[model samples]
Target chain A: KQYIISEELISEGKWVKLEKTTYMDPTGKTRTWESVKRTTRKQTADGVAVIPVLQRTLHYECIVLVKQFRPPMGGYCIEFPAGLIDDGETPEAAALRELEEETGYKGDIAECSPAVCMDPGLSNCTIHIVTVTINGDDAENARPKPKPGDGEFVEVISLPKNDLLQRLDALVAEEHLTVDARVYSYALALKHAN
Target chain B: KQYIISEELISEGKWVKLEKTTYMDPTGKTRTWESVKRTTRKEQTADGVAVIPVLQRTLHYECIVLVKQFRPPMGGYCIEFPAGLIDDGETPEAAALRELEEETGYKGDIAECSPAVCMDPGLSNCTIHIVTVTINGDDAENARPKPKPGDGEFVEVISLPKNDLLQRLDALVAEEHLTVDARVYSYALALKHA
Candidate 1:
């Protein structure tokens, strides 16, 4: 038999609450389970918090060099400009800001969509896929620069879209770019590029 | 002027003490950075694990059933299966046992290159993609009941090869099955059926 002794709030954020549940498993082993509950305050129509993704589209034939210094991968990785959604910023707004901040391009967003990424078991962070549209001016305007808050230094390398995809595929085949960003970007490019 | 700090570890599996650097930023704010050097241990490579689908290609047909669930849309919601890395084990044999116990209803020798679940992220921790060739019948024969251990509950359903991959699974999504198991089983059914 399973028993729930009590529930305590470990942490409370604007959109969710972390609750620790004390329970006794079938074998009489006491175990603690940490569960996150979505708050009604910021619930979407589906009663879940929306994770926004920032996306920018460049019309320039140049490459959208991704900076290479994420700690998780041991080195830097190349990817499109993206960031998490701010407290009150819309997905599009966040995308625009991140694009300008990371890549130095100021452009209007053209398309957005809902996308979910899975780690299967370890985590449950849902990723929203947003798409942006930009022109040559936006690409040229958005040059790579070190932001005040961003700690790492990054270099920009540009490539054509087809070449970028080829590089991405080769890296994937070579087991270089392992994250979904590259694949997702490839999918988006394939779907939207005319 | 920017300065770069580098260090090398002198011992194995031990920490190397290093001097800290302090500097003033462009804003005249003083910042301190700690650079720690650590030696690498010659243990097995920590890479993402993979699982293969067990299929018997009898002259006529192929069969596989994928587990699915309704995943959280943003943070933890989307539909996917119970797949993950094999961590906390000493040998590949031990790791395989742990993964099988954690994910599905099988515990035996993991055949090589059967069906694979590919990992998308290249930078994250022991993220696993699985593929299995020959499955032991005894393990599945003595499978236990579903253990409601995590965020949500799960139900088990089976699908056949011919009727697995079809429009019906999409209909289930459209009809809102809302559980990972149902969604993935439906997907497998669609794929197999097709």
Candidate 2:
């Protein structure tokens, strides 16, 4: 299993831990890259993967999004409902759980990608993109509604099928929504998917 | 000014540095979220990734510009947007445009840019800017299969029609392979553009 054998926290009262590390580059000279370990999970040992759940609503012909205030940004962040996979939870199970928890919507993995990363040049972090389908009756009730227990706030938002091809930018520019890269990428993709 | 007063280089010598920060959040919270930063010059806070959509008038479709790179964490090659660091004083638009020039060698103008955002907020404070770009005249240069044979900076520029991009990604999925997380966002963007 790909795992962290040993680690050290460089600080405290923090959301993540910085670990000092070194390795010989291809040249055999030593090099280093600082890392951020997610300590937010209660079962911290399982804090290895990032699963980005891509959810779609078939009945309403819309997409599902969650708007929440990130503690770090301390501002609203509009993104897909994602969460950590605690030990014993499959990524699909985690995706389903987070979708319901964050968006008040139930979804299942119609298509799931293997683990992937966003910024390799930054840290040793990785994630997966699991495309989900919130179908039929579930899709009908899958409106923007946040589940409770969130310290900051999580406001769910759903975009219309036509919105992407139509008014997504207007919404972004005029509303000042801090659209995440993945969310905005899909919106932009809609303009070109044809 | 939304400013970073000072940052301690927690660790240095590798490709990245773990920097702890004290910044006034949008809400004025003196929040601390450790950031993983590239150790290269410019010391820019983060990255600006471009999702360039090239339109083919005759084809009545848009083409996506992407790259295939071997991310060390995944232990395999992964597909991703043409991305790079934001220069010290460069705006995201400038960063996107410049990365396009170096990473893909394609010509395009920034049409829209989403608010920069963090990927793993609970783990790292690292943020990245997302830009939507439109390329010129079918982008004959990018019409080829992938990036040129040899550029010190490595990448295989995969230029495909917006819909074709869906199939390309689907092909990866069929084989249980995955691209970067942002690629799926582009898939959504492409579908809307369609």
RMSDs, each prediction? 10.0, 6.1
Specify the CAPRI tier of model 2. acceptable
What tens digits encode model 1's per-residue C-alpha lDDT throughout A147-170? 523543444445554354465555
Tens-place lDDT per residue, model 1, B110-163, is 554211122222213222333343344435442452423343334243333433
User: Candidate 1 chain B, which ten residues in sequence have the lowest lDDT sum?
Assistant: B114-123
What 10-residue stretch in candidate 1 chain A is worst by lDDT? A43-52
On the 0 to 100 scale, the lDDT of residue A114 in model 1 is 38
DockQ of 1: 0.11
lDDT string, candidate 2, B113-144, tens digits:
66665655544455676677877745576454
Q: Which regions of candidate 1 fall more than 4 Å away from where they truly are?
A: A1-65, A72-74, A106-111, A115-120, A137-166, A169-194, B1-66, B69-78, B87-194
Residue B120 in model 1: shift from native, Å? 11
